[PDB]
Design a protein around this ligand. Structure first.
Ligand SMILES: O=S(=O)(NCc1n[nH]nc1CNC1CCCCC1)c1cc(Cl)ccc1Cl
Ligand SMILES: [O-]
Ligand SMILES: [Zn+2]
Ligand SMILES: [Zn+2]
Length: 230
C-alpha cells in the first residue's frame, strides 16, 4: 500500500493518508545515475495546509501541488524545509509562485544558498540550539542536533502522534548510510536520543526516504550509523 520507488514515474507524486489530516507525499528523482524515492508531509492547518519539504525539484513540486488540489482540495499556505538539500528545498520557487510562504531555519537558508539551492523566504526563529522546539500551527518543529546534516529538523504532529524524522531517520530495510558527506556521524546517535526523549508517544515515524514505521526506526538508524562509523 505505501508506494515504492519503482511504482512512481519521475515527475509524478503520490499522497498517502497517515491519519486524519495528515499525509505523506512521495516523489522520485534521478541523482548520480539512480532514481530514489523521497517523502515529505502535509498537515491540515484549519482551512489551509502546512507542507513539510518539497517533492525534490520544480517539476515534482508542481505535481505535488496539483495532486494536493485534486485529492485534498485546500490551499497550501506555508511550507517548512527540514534541511538544505535539494530533496527538501528544490521546488521552493514553485511553492512561492503558487502563493506559499516558505520557511526554514537561518542555518538552512544559509547552507542552501552556498550549495546553490533554492532558498526558503522566511527564517524560523527559536531553533538554533539542539533541543530547541517551536510551535508552527498544527505541528511542533524540533532541532535535535546534527545528524544527517547539521541543520536537520524533525516535525511532530501532536494531534495525530506522527513524527516526521526526515533524512535523520532511516527506513527499516535500509542497512547502509550511503553518502555521509554532510553528516555528523558522531553526533547522530545523541541527536536521536533527544528525539526519543522528546517524543516517546509517537505512533507513526516517517523517514525522509522509504517506508513509514514506528519508534523502532530510531534505534534502527542509530545501529546503521554506528556500524558505518566503525
Ligand atoms: O546516497 S544515499 O543512499 N544516502 C544519502 C542520503 N540520505 N538521506 N538523503 C540522502 C540524499 N541526499 C541528497 C543530497 C543532494 C541532493 C539530493 C539528495 C541517497 C541518495 C539520494 Cl540522492 C536520495 C536518497 C538516498 Cl537514501
Ligand atoms: O537529503
Ligand atoms: Zn539530505
Ligand atoms: Zn535525503
Amino acid at each position: 500500500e505505501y508506494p515504492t520507488v519503482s511504482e512512481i514515474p519521475v515527475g509524478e507524486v503520490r499522497l498517502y493518508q497517515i491519519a486524519d489530516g495528515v499525509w505523506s507525499h512521495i516523489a522520485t528523482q534521478s541523482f548520480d545515475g539512480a532514481v530514489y524515492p523521497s517523502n515529505g508531509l502535509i498537515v491540515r492547518d484549519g482551512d489551509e495546509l502546512l507542507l513539510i519539504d518539497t517533492a525534490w525539484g520544480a517539476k515534482n513540486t508542481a505535481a505535488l501541488l496539483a495532486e494536493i488540489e485534486k485529492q485534498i482540495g485546500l490551499p497550501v499556505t506555508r511550507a517548512v524545509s527540514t534541511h538544505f538539500h535539494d530533496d527538501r528545498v528544490g521546488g521552493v520557487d514553485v511553492l512561492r509562485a503558487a502563493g506559499v510562504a516558505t520557511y526554514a531555519s537561518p542555518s538552512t537558508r544559509r547552507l542552501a544558498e552556498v550549495e546553490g539551492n533554492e532558498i526558503p523566504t522566511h527564517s524560523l526563529e527559536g531553533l538554533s540550539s539542539s533541543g530547541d522546539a517551536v510551535r508552527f500551527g498544527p505541528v511542533e518543529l524540533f532541532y535535535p542536533g546534527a545528524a544527517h546534516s547539521t541543520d536537520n529538523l524533525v516535525v511532530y504532529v501532536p494531534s495525530a502522534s506522527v513524527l516526521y524524522g526526515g533524512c535523520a531517520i532511516y527506513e527499516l530495510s535500509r542497512t547502509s548510510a550511503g553518502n555521509v558527506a554532510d553528516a555528523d556521524l558522531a553526533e547522530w546517535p545523541t541527536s536521536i536520543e533527544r528525539i526519543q526523549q522528546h517524543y516517546p508517544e509517537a505512533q507513526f515515524v516517517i523517514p525522509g526516504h522509504g517506508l513509514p514505521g514506528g519508534l523502532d526506526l530510531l534505534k534502527h538508524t542509530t545501529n546503521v550509523v554506528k556500524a558505518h562509523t566503525n
